[PDB]
Paper text:
Bromo and extra-terminal ([name]) proteins provide a recruitment platform initiated by the recognition of acetylated lysines (Kac) by their tandem bromodomains (BRD, Dhalluin et al., 1999, Jacobson et al., 2000, Owen et al., 2000). BETs, like all of the 42 human BRD-containing proteins, contain additional interaction domains that recruit other proteins to the acetylated protein target, forming complex assemblies and contributing to processes such as chromatin remodeling and transcription. Direct targeting of [name]-BRDs by small-molecule inhibitors such as the high-affinity and pan-[name] specificity thienodiazepine (+)-JQ1 (hereafter referred to as JQ1) enables their displacement from Kac. Multiple decreased interactors harbor sequences that can directly associate with [name]-BRDs in canonical or new BRD-mediated structural binding modes, and we propose that the tandem BRDs present in each [name] protein may be capable of simultaneously recruiting both a histone and a second interactor.
However, when crystallizing a Kac-XX-Kac [name] peptide ([name]/[name]) with [name]/BD1, we surprisingly found only the first Kac within the binding cavity. Strikingly, a bulky tyrosine residue located 5 residues downstream of the first lysine (Y277) instead inserted into the BRD cavity, stabilizing [name] via a hydrogen bond. This, together with our finding that several histone peptides with longer linkers readily bind [name] BRDs (Kac-X3–4-Kac), suggested that associations could be mediated via more diverse protein sequences and structural templates than initially suspected. We show that Kac-XX-Kac sites on non-histone proteins insert both Kac in the BRD cavity as in the previously characterized histone H4 peptide (Filippakopoulos et al., 2012, Morinière et al., 2009), while longer linkers can insert bulky residues in place of the second Kac (e.g., [name] Kac-X4-Y motif).
Residue numbers in the entry:
A (entry chain A): 42 to 168
B (entry chain B): 43 to 167
C (entry chain D): 270 to 279
Amino acid sequence: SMNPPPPETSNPNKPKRQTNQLQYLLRVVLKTLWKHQFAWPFQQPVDAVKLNLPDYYKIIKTPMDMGTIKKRLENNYYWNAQECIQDFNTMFTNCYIYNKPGDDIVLMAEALEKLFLQKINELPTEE
Amino acid sequence: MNPPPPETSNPNKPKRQTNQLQYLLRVVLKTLWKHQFAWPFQQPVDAVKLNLPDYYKIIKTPMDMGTIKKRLENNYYWNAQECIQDFNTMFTNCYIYNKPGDDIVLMAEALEKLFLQKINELPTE
Amino acid sequence: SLKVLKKYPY
C-alpha cells in the first residue's frame, strides 16, 4: 500500500488573517508540544510504508500530525483558532483509535494531550 | 541506563589493511547501511529512549552497524572473520530479544539475506 | 517490554 498524500497545508483561495490566538497556538502551544520528550511519533504524517502499517489508512480516514499543523499555522491556513484545536484533537483521537489503551504510544499521546489542554487553558481572549 | 557503546578503537593493535576488510567496508557495510530496513540497526539500541528496560539484561553482546562502521574505519579487526562475527551477533541479538515474525525480526532477516549474498562474493586474500 | 515499530524513532 502507498502512503496517501499528506493533508493540505496551503490553499491560496482561502482568505487569511492573523490573530493573537493563532499566534499563541504557534508560538506557545505547538512549540511546547514539539519539544516534549514523547513528541517524535507525532512530528510528521504516519509513514505506513516505513512502519509497515497496511491497515493504518484503512482505519484512519482523517490523518493529522504536528508537522501538518505547524505548516498550516506558518501558512496562515487557519481562519479560526478552533480549526487548529480540532486538528490537535484529531491527532490525539486518531492515535487512540488505531492503537489500544495502555500501549506505550497511547501513553505518549496522552502526555502530549495533557500538556495541550494545560496550554489551551491559557489561550488568550481574542484581542 | 544504557551501557556505553561497544569499543571501536584499540591503540594496542598495529594497522593491517586487507582487500577482504576493504570489501567489508566499501561493499558490505555500505550496501547494508543503505537498505530500506537498516534504520533500526544503524546505532546501538537505546533501551532508555525505547522503553526496553530488559534489553541489556538479555543482550550482553550488543552490536550495531554504526559500531561495525567505526571498527572497520579504525582498523579494529585483524581479519574478515572478526567483522563477520559482529554482523552475525547483531542479527542473532535481534532474533533472541524479539518475538519470531515481528517486524523488526523480518527486517533483520532481510538484511541477513543480503549480508550472506555479499559474503558469498567475498574476494580471496 | 516489546518493540513496536510504530513508535521507533527514525
